[PDB]
Ligand binder design. Structure first.
Ligand SMILES: C[C@]12CC[C@H]3[C@@H](CCC4=CC(=O)CC[C@@]43C)[C@@H]1CC[C@@H]2O
Lengths: 219, 220
């Protein structure tokens, strides 16, 4: 069992710059035959992993010359020159010189872009859900950067701390941004006992939260 | 063109069994080494088994004796028999073909998700997401669908049968109380909806659920 340690776990890089990933084995990867079965893979969001480099420095058919690999024994490196948006995802190195063959933990390549404020939308519970005796208020915070953001929920003025579920999407290749979903769930009964529902987005791009809300007395 | 397709994933109870399939084509079947690799929740990849051209099979400690890889040369089908399943076995299972001489995992399938749990299968509830009171804010309207309370993973979401692809955001499911919840949003021009239809297509294979929820204007 050759433990393959990969660092960093996450790596920021601006378009057109260079990025390097490190991969190190707890034992030599040089085989008796003299070869070193060290490989690199890329798995884009929602997709299967794909071969990029094998035998330390050999590029798989189709891979751009921007991707180069190097190293020996226990230290290996993957360099990505002239980075493009499509290069984002998680990169993995693999060892096939010793059985069982193992993978590194992975490195997520993040593309740097201009800071962008989220586009916030709030939605009241659907009729169908109310009929079920439930009520979820949903807030979308779309296309923002950087990834760090906070959502605060307020019912008739007071912040509501329980019953919330958030979910960040992976970085989008098309615009290098992120998106997040915030859902506040209560029972139908407690919901119909209040009027205003608001979700406040706290992002780096402003010293004051973006606010969206609706009143039930309104239509 | 090399083509690998997995199938058979789904829900199984602890200590249970399951046999996954991987239909291959585009290459001479018994000439290369075929393997099974899995990816856990933390996105970590782990080799599960391989069978080389000669016929010898290889396994890892964590699975030897419970998992059995085999191939049906006549049908070009690669199997992975699982038994005495554990919660740790929960993951996406990929079958792959080597490039050559034990070098690289050159071709991968789409993967079939295997969930090992005692939780009960549960259909998702799809709720339409429409604005509450229209006014101002540019000229683009954002809509959504809340796919709530299902088990297990996965779930498929598309808009207008895949015809509406631009400006869509589908968020990863989040687990809470043995149940999963996910949402998706689609941004379109105000001049379109609701005169032009916008419907989300939600599919949950485990329960054989397939729902088409149309987005309608909210009432008073
Ligand atoms: C999985 C693999 C095919 C099976 C190979 C593996 C390298 C290590 C190895 C050594 C053996 O003696 C049997 C075949 C295996 C188990 C290769 C790594 C990439 C390739 O696709």
């Amino acid at each position: 069992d050759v433990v393959v340690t990969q660092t960093p776990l996450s790596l920021p890089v601006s378009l057109g710059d260079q990025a390097s990933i490190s991969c190190r084995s707890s034992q030599s990867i040089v085989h008796s035959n003299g070869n070193s079965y060290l490989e690199w893979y890329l798995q884009k969001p929602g997709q299967s992993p794909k071969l990029l480099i094998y035998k330390v420095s050999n590029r798989f058919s189709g891979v751009p010359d921007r991707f180069s690999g190097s190293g020996s024994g226990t230290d290996f490196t993957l360099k990505i020159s002239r980075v493009e948006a499509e290069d984002l995802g998680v990169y993995y190195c693999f060892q096939g010189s010793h059985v069982p063959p193992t993978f590194g933990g992975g490195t997520k390549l993040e593309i740097k872009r201009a800071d962008a404020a989220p586009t916030v939308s709030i939605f009241p519970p659907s009729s169908e859900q109310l009929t079920s005796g439930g009520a979820s208020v949903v807030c979308f915070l779309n296309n923002f950067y950087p990834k760090d953001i906070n959502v605060k929920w307020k019912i008739d003025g007071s912040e509501r701390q329980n019953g919330v579920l958030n979910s960040w999407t992976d970085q989008d290749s098309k615009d290098s941004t992120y998106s997040m979903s915030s859902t506040l769930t209560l029972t139908k009964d407690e919901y119909e006992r209040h009027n205003s529902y608001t979700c406040e987005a706290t992002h780096k791009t402003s010293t004051s939260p973006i606010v969206k809300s609706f009143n039930r007395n309104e239509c | 063109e090399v083509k690998l397709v997995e199938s058979g994933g789904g829900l199984v109870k602890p200590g249970g069994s399951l046999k996954l399939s991987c239909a291959a084509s585009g290459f001479t079947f018994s000439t290369y080494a075929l393997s099974w690799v899995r990816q856990t929740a933390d996105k970590r990849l782990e080799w599960v088994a391989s069978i080389v051209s000669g016929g010898n099979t290889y396994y890892s400690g964590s699975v030897k004796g419970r998992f059995t890889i085999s191939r049906d040369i006549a049908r070009n089908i690669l199997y992975l028999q699982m038994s005495s399943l554990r919660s740790e076995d929960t993951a996406m299972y990929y079958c792959a073909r080597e490039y050559y001489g034990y070098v690289g995992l050159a071709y991968w399938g789409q993967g079939t998700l295997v969930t090992v749990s005692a939780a009960k299968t549960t259909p998702p509830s799809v709720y339409p997401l429409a604005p509450g009171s229209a006014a101002q804010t540019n000229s683009m309207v954002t809509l959504g669908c809340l796919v709530k309370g299902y088990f297990p993973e996965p779930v498929t979401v598309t808009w207008n049968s895949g015809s509406l692809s631009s400006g869509v955001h589908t968020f990863p499911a989040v687990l809470q109380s043995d149940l999963y919840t996910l949402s998706s949003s689609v941004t379109v021009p105000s001049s379109t909806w609701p005169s032009e239809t916008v419907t989300c297509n939600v599919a949950h294979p485990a329960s054989s659920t397939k729902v088409d929820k149309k987005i309608v204007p909210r009432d008073c």
